[PDB]
């Protein structure tokens, strides 16, 4: 099977468990075959009055021992087989999460966050049944079928056994075709689960927008359409799933008629003994169950093949940014010099950065300004290594950025995103992301360097205030100051303030800027702002116009160069 060939990696790791399970299963088969013969012997001995007192105390004891043995060994092999299915879920979930944690935005642009969740909570459930109930049914039905085939071939006859088997190949081909189609149908249906998850997420993450504009009616209708689409793709699987039972029943009933007819003909020609045919009919009656078992098996295996295929598709996404195999032993970054950097985003077609070249010397504070959609944050992202490296080069003290392990580089850089990102924890927990093993005094210092003590006094529980999901239980400026404290906690070599003063009033903005000027003295800083009062201290100011540095220099020359910088300066201060 494709699913088993794909799970061979796990089956090899866990071989003793399944070996024990199979051995116990075969043993249980035999130890269950015995009770029928024992009871038959007991009843036969009860006929002529030969059943004595010893017979009772022997039959009762042997039946009790048989019951206890079957119970214990069955418990054990069901523990081993099914117990190995849960390990499927655990291992696959761990692998999936560990893969997601090392994935860059380019991966997340293509893969929706609703689809991924369905790939770790539902696909695993589909795949789990393959190694548990799937393996049990396979081996159990195979042993039962082989026992029926062998007993009919040695006890009764061979011609009859080869007679009531002709239907079986046709059943095999039919079930194989149905499984092949059900694989595609179930792959299509499973994706409709990710779409439903995404639809539910969007209607929840953006509830405020929907309710403010009164789009509830147009939101319920879209969800109803999505549910109808999901239902349609489920029926396309039902139309094939329902064919597994009728086919098996028909092609076993044909076997029954063939066997009975051939047996009657052989009896008429005097090849049978008239007691062989009754036993043969009894044996034929048993054949039905393994066929239903194999049909259910083929149905289940394909249900897990599609989900495993999706999980493997997720897990086979090579990293966009690769940690160097032979890194550089650089300890601290001295000079960040861009040289003819040309970078275009994956989904774009126009060069977002075009021939960028500037130098940031150790300790210098660099400001980047420009109209909306110019490329300011693209440089910061070039430093952060979120997307595959573009052209040109970015050398950290003469060593290209590529030949530096991501852990060290990330430790160097303290990032403040332009879009606030917070988790559902206490304020202190969020602030400690920069330095988990940090004393309360360090947190207090970081807070006081972001002009946030007054808010802490104002807040209900102070540092122990649970911020709602995404921080919805805080003001925008409070989120910004929490992010600034997070960045400043680690005391990063390079501090990236990407529009970190946007919802911070004017007094709070002045205070934070003064603190930064007195905190990053002699350290590297990238300040991105639309207000030009936060870049007055910068040694190098870069004006970005459509992916190209239109102007450069400090405040004085940019003022003396007229153009965009002087225009904005005059419109922002002389007002």
């Amino acid at each position: 099977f494709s699913v088993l060939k794909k799970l061979g990696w796990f089956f090899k790791a866990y071989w003793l468990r399944y070996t024990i399970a199979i051995v116990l299963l075969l043993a249980v088969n035999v130890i269950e075959m015995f009770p029928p013969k024992l009871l038959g012997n007991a009843i036969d001995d009860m006929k002529a009055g030969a059943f004595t007192a010893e017979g009772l105390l022997f039959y009762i004891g042997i039946f009790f021992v048989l019951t206890a043995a079957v119970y214990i060994m069955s418990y054990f092999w069901m523990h081993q087989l099914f117990g190995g299915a849960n390990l499927m879920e655990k291992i696959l979930r761990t692998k999936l999460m560990g893969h997601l944690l090392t994935m860059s935005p380019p991966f997340y642009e293509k893969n929706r966050t609703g689809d991924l969740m369905a790939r770790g909570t539902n696909d695993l459930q589909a795949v789990s049944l393959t190694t548990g109930f799937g393996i049990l049914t396979l081996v159990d039905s195979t042993m039962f079928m082989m026992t029926i085939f062998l007993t009919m071939g040695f006890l009764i006859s061979w011609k009859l056994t080869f007679a009531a088997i002709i239907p079986l190949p046709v059943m095999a081909i039919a079930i194989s075709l149905y499984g092949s189609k059900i694989h595609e149908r179930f792959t299509e249906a499973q994706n409709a689960f990710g779409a439903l998850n995404d639809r539910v997420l969007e209607s929840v993450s953006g509830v405020r927008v929907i309710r403010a504009y009164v789009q509830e009616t147009n939101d319920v209708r879209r969800f109803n359409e999505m549910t109808a689409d999901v239902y349609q793709k489920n029926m396309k699987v039902a139309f094939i799933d329902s064919l597994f039972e009728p086919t098996v029943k028909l092609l076993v009933g044909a076997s029954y008629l063939i066997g009975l007819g051939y047996g009657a003909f052989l009896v008429f020609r005097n090849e049978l003994t008239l007691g062989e045919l009754v036993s043969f009919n009894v044996y034929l009656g048993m054949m039905i169950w393994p066929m239903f078992a194999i049909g259910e098996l083929i149905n289940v295996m394909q249900r897990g093949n599609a989900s495993l295929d999706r999980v493997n598709e997720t897990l086979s996404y090579e990293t966009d940014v690769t940690d160097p195999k032979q890194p550089a032993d650089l300890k601290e970054p001295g000079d960040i010099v861009f040289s003819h950097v040309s970078f275009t985003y994956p989904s774009s077609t126009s060069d977002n950065l075009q021939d960028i070249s500037f130098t940031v010397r150790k300790g210098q504070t660099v400001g980047i300004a420009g109209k909306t959609g110019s490329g300011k944050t693209t440089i910061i992202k070039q430093l952060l290594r979120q997307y595959p490296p573009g052209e040109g080069s970015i050398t950290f003290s003469g060593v290209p950025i590529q030949q530096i392990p991501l852990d060290r580089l990330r430790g160097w850089i303290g990032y403040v995103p332009q879009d606030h990102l917070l988790f559902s924890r206490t304020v202190k927990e969020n602030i400690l992301y920069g330095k988990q093993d940090a004393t309360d005094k360090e947190v207090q210092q970081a807070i006081a360097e972001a002009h946030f003590e007054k808010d802490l006094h104002m807040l209900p529980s102070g540092l122990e205030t649970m911020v709602g999901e995404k921080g919805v239980a805080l003001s925008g400026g409070q989120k910004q100051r929490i992010s600034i404290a997070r960045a400043l906690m680690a005391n990063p070599e390079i501090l990236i303030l990407d529009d970190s003063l946007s919802a911070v009033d004017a007094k709070t903005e002045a205070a934070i800027i003064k603190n930064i000027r007195e905190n990053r003295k002699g350290k590297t800083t990238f300040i991105l702002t639309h207000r030009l009062s936060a870049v007055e201290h910068a040694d190098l100011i870069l004006v970005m116009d459509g992916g190209v540095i239109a102007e450069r220099g400090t405040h004085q020359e940019l003022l003396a160069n007229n153009g965009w910088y002087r225009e904005q300066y005059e419109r922002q201060q002389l007002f």
Partner: protein, 669 residues
Amino acid sequence: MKIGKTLWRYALLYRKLLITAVLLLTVAVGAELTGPFIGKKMIDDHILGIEKTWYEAAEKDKNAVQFHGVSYVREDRLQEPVSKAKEAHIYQVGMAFYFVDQAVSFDGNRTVSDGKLTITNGDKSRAYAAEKLTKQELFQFYQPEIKGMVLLICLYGGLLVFSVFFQYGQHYLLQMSANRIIQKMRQDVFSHIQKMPIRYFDNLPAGKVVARITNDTEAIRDLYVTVLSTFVTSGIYMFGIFTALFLLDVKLAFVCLAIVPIIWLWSVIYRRYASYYNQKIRSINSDINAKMNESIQGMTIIQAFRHQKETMREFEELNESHFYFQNRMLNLNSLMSHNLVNVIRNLAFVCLIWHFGGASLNAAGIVSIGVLYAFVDYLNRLFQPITGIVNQFSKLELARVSAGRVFELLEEKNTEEAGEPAKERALGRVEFRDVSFAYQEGEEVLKHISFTAQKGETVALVGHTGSGKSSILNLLFRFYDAQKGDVLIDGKSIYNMSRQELRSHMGIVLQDPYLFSGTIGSNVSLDDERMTEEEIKNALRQVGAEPLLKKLPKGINEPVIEKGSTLSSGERQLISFARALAFDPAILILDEATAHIDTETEAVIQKALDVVKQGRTTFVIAHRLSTIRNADQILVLDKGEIVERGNHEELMALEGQYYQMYELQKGQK
């Protein structure tokens, strides 16, 4: 019982499909059960039927077979004389048939004839005679049986072929009904979630609500397909077995009925445990989803601050708990499964042996052994159905737990009613009267808010971070109800109007823009109202987004990824601003709209606003005092209280917080 009495209602809704499925299932089960009995009839009447008495009759009996010049007739194919001549039995010792033409016999005991068939049953073994029938005479004897089989096998073939459709129809209808019920459940849950207040969403992870809709509804399907099918099939099988048992015995089928209580008791013992674990499992599942959504949406920060190890450790705890509780269900599914029913079967055999073993001392049962073969066969057939249903308890309990988790959400008492959009455009008279608000009990975030906005004016809200301006916006939109005071649109209080009408009176630009999936035009238009492309383009040009369009190939048709990840924050803000301006709202509310937008585009936006702000009330919450420099009245908030108000000249003429903030914003030069 909410869980039991509710799943019935959903089944009752689609009662036509389910009733048809049950009828098809019953017919298919009846046909399948009958089949083997047709086979048994064929056997016992056509291939084993050359064993009963062959009365010695003459010709002209409508059926007769020549044998050594004398034609005999079978017992049943014979007409109705009484004891015509004698009984000429047939017996098949070894593998060949031997004719008994001498006289009658008794209960047979096969023994080699050697010309004299010895029937050693008791003592009467006369060794009558024997004559091998060769092969041609046997075929002559069997020809009418050939006719019978050929006319009876086709009956089995017909019953088989005409019963193929019923199985497919039953299964397809069951699955269709299950899918329809899941669809209805999801739609109802989504409607209710649309009917819940914002407090519910603010302190609940988005992954815990998606789980209750999608994850917790997939697990209820099995309750209607596999469980129902298996229960119906087993019920029919056991009814057949029991009615069969009662006919051939009494006081021995009554004891067999003791199986019915035991299973019930078994279920009661299983449920009590399978419940507790299942709940936990389900709960943990939700958490995992949350952890998969919280982490994915914030992966950039997790990687930037090297929090991967802790996040994986945080995730691994939930995975380990889920795995542990699944293992705890392994023990229950192992103790109460096929095993226990096989334990009872052996116990039943032991009880039968002990009871009849104590009766075989006097050989009582052997004389009455006519009720032993049938009883043992029926007892063995009894446990095949039972093993079918006991395996359905796990699915039943999982479905019950999932249904309960869905219904506890569907039955939430807290809920806000709904109305219809506004019928008449509002003049634009917005008034706050003595409004006091507190997000958390005992903590007033706004204290005695009082002001009035007239049509054609521009009320600007200013203050330090955390003052409570966005709280004023929340109260105006009735996301959060006030606690003391009133809010009036025109002269009507906003609490006597439907929320949909109030929110239709105004269009807002939220502090943090949100972009839905689809094209930019979709976000600007939200797929409602009159989405004329020219109007959308006009709004985009008004907001100053024109460059963004000429930097994109398809313009307003450019696809927008989830959350607009491929758009700069300023571009997202411009798109949201255009969305707000495209509805031509009576009251326009801006909540720090120009926060990530440069000064050039900000000036363009202000120019666009001024042109059509002579007949539209506007609320501006801005930390950039330049945009509200020329406003009808500015209000300064401090700790949730309005301390200063008036025109800009009035505010500057009295110094104060606004004066200080404006001077700081103004060039220190």
